Amino acid sequence: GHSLQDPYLNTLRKERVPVSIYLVNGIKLQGQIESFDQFVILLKNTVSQMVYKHAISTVVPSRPVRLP
Amino acid sequence: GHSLQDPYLNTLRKERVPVSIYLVNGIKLQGQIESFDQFVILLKNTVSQMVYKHAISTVVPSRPVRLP
Amino acid sequence: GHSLQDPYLNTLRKERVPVSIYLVNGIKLQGQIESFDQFVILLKNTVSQMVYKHAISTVVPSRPVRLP
Amino acid sequence: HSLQDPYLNTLRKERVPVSIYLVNGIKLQGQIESFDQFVILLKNTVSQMVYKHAISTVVPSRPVRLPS
Amino acid sequence: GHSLQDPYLNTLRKERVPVSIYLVNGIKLQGQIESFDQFVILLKNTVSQMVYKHAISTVVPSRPVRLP
Amino acid sequence: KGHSLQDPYLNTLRKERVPVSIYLVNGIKLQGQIESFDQFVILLKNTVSQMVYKHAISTVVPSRPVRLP
Numbered sequence: 001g002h003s004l005q006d007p008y009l010n011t012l013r014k015e016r017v018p019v020s021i022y023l024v025n026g027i028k029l030q031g032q033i034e035s036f037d038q039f040v041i042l043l044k045n046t047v048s049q050m051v052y053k054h055a056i057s058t059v060v061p062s063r064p065v066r067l068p
Numbered sequence: 069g070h071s072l073q074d075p076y077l078n079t080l081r082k083e084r085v086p087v088s089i090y091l092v093n094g095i096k097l098q099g100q101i102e103s104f105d106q107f108v109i110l111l112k113n114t115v116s117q118m119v120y121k122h123a124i125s126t127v128v129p130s131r132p133v134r135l136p
Numbered sequence: 137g138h139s140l141q142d143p144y145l146n147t148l149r150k151e152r153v154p155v156s157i158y159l160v161n162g163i164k165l166q167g168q169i170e171s172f173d174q175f176v177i178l179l180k181n182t183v184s185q186m187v188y189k190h191a192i193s194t195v196v197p198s199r200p201v202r203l204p
Numbered sequence: 205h206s207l208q209d210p211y212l213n214t215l216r217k218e219r220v221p222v223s224i225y226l227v228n229g230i231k232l233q234g235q236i237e238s239f240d241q242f243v244i245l246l247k248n249t250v251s252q253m254v255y256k257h258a259i260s261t262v263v264p265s266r267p268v269r270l271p272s
Numbered sequence: 273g274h275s276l277q278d279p280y281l282n283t284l285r286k287e288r289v290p291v292s293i294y295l296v297n298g299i300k301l302q303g304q305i306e307s308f309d310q311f312v313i314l315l316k317n318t319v320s321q322m323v324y325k326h327a328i329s330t331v332v333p334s335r336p337v338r339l340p
Numbered sequence: 341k342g343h344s345l346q347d348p349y350l351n352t353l354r355k356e357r358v359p360v361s362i363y364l365v366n367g368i369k370l371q372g373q374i375e376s377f378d379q380f381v382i383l384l385k386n387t388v389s390q391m392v393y394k395h396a397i398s399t400v401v402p403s404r405p406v407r408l409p
């Protein structure tokens with residue numbers, strides 16, 4: 001399920017970790033995860049934007065992180 | 069669920085906030101959200117059009133949105 | 137849910153409005169919506185072709201259209 | 205699938221020559237030999253299985269009776 | 273519903289038929305169907321690699337195959 | 341057959357810690373070890389553990405063959 005995606009995203013959110021989100025088309029977004037639900041992530045940095053999960057390849061934290 | 073996506077689109081809709089919508093294929097659409105449902109967004113501006121969510125990567129508001 | 141997509145496509149259909157349908161790969165199709173269901177749209181012209189909704193980015197009517 | 209199935213079944217049973225445009229822009233030609241919910245067997249020189257998720261459009265070479 | 277895909281893939285597996293698998297991105301994989309489930313295919317050659325179906329456009333056997 | 345192949349296959353690569361290559365839909369090649377996975381994502385370990393959406397993966401390729409249970 002999301003039995004893993006969620007605590008991971010939530011850990012990045014809670015602790016305000018800088019991340020790169022890579023999109024399926026190769027576009028790289030940077031920021032902190034402000035919030036998220038089942039389908040979108042709200043990314044904040046130089047401009048705030050709502051990102052669709054279905055368009056995301058990877059989420060890469062800038063530092064190692066406690067895992068579920 | 070859609071606990072985040074929906075109040076976010078509704079606030080954009082209600083406050084007529086100009087948005088940029090970036091499609092998975094890199095095309096940028098521009099305008100205001102007239103309405104939406106689970107699967108599509110109705111975008112009005114110089115050009116009015118129905119946009120399938122599955123083709124959307126990000127929604128970038130022209131100014132930040134305060135959620136309820 | 138479908139509260140917008142259905143009445144929007146049904147209106148375009150009943151009114152025989154010429155539409156531009158942009159595919160996810162950038163290609164543009166033009167014609168009239170002959171019919172549609174959950175997964176496909178039948179686009180009328182020289183022949184009526186079947187278009188999977190999953191392959192569509194946007195539907196753009198040639199003229200402004202209301203949905204009373 | 206109230207439209208897709210009778211439409212593909214007409215194409216199959218009348219052995220109508222078709223074009224299948226894929227989401228990446230590749231164009232396949234042949235005839236529909238069989239299909240189910242997820243795949244179409246496209247028949248020709250070499251026959252092949254096409255995933256509907258990779259199809260953008262299905263374009264018959266001639267007009268065909270339309271499901272009503 | 274799966275009355276084509278399963279028996280097609282299973283015939284290709286049982287008979288160890290050389291196949292080409294084309295991905296939506298243009299990549300051409302070659303080998304033989306080792307096993308498959310609802311979502312992935314195990315494609316044997318130098319190692320058995322897991323191919324996600326959603327990434328596949330077509331499956332093309334190296335020779336014709338009689339179905340059950 | 342549901343996930344009767346994908347789960348044990350990924351589980352094998354996880355438990356045996358076999359290095360894999362994960363190719364993305366856009367051609368990009370990621371490399372590391374499968375730390376864990378759920379229905380939707382795979383955690384890929386190297387410098388940091390990045391999260392890979394399955395919907396963006398075309399293939400997972402083990403650096404060396406392995407066997408299913």
Ligand SMILES: Nc1ncnc2c1ncn2[C@@H]1O[C@H](COP(=O)(O)OP(=O)(O)OP(=O)(O)O)[C@@H](O)[C@H]1O
Pocket residue numbers: 022026028057058060364368370390
């Ligand atoms: N974890 C990842 N997921 C998806 N794509 C990635 C990832 N890491 C790198 N890429 C992409 O792979 C390509 C090659 O990576 P490389 O490290 O050479 O790029 P880079 O110079 O670091 O650029 P960037 O800082 O934008 O990643 C780049 O287009 C990059 O954006």
Ligand SMILES: Nc1ncnc2c1ncn2[C@@H]1O[C@H](COP(=O)(O)OP(=O)(O)OP(=O)(O)O)[C@@H](O)[C@H]1O
Pocket residue numbers: 027049090094095096125126128
């Ligand atoms: N927030 C975003 N989400 C997804 N894709 C984006 C985003 N911002 C830019 N891109 C993509 O990155 C590519 C690089 O273009 P760039 O961002 O430099 O132009 P731009 O700053 O958007 O210009 P303008 O603001 O005038 O549109 C664009 O093709 C665009 O599709």
Ligand SMILES: Nc1ncnc2c1ncn2[C@@H]1O[C@H](COP(=O)(O)OP(=O)(O)OP(=O)(O)O)[C@@H](O)[C@H]1O
Pocket residue numbers: 095117158162163164193194196
């Ligand atoms: N409303 C839209 N939705 C999705 N894609 C679009 C839309 N409008 C244009 N495009 C695509 O984006 C690309 C660049 O857009 P641009 O602003 O140049 O439109 P255009 O090329 O003048 O339109 P046309 O191709 O009809 O002349 C075009 O190839 C077109 O296919």
Ligand SMILES: Nc1ncnc2c1ncn2[C@@H]1O[C@H](COP(=O)(O)OP(=O)(O)OP(=O)(O)O)[C@@H](O)[C@H]1O
Pocket residue numbers: 163185225229231260261263
């Ligand atoms: N029904 C369709 N579905 C998807 N793409 C199409 C369709 N018809 C044409 N195209 C694409 O539109 C582009 C422009 O088509 P144009 O009418 O200029 O040439 P064409 O005669 O359609 O070429 P062809 O049919 O050989 O692809 C081509 O790249 C073609 O692949």
Ligand SMILES: Nc1ncnc2c1ncn2[C@@H]1O[C@H](COP(=O)(O)OP(=O)(O)OP(=O)(O)O)[C@@H](O)[C@H]1O
Pocket residue numbers: 299301318321363366367368369398399400401
């Ligand atoms: N299993 C695979 N899944 C998806 N893409 C692949 C795969 N193998 C190769 N590619 C594509 O090939 C390009 C580089 O080729 P690569 O070195 O990965 O071939 P290879 O698989 O090592 O060949 P061989 O199977 O002969 O060892 C990458 O951009 C990648 O997109």
Ligand code: NA
Pocket residue numbers: 022026027028
């Ligand atoms: Na990149």
Ligand code: NA
Pocket residue numbers: 163228229230
């Ligand atoms: Na094309």
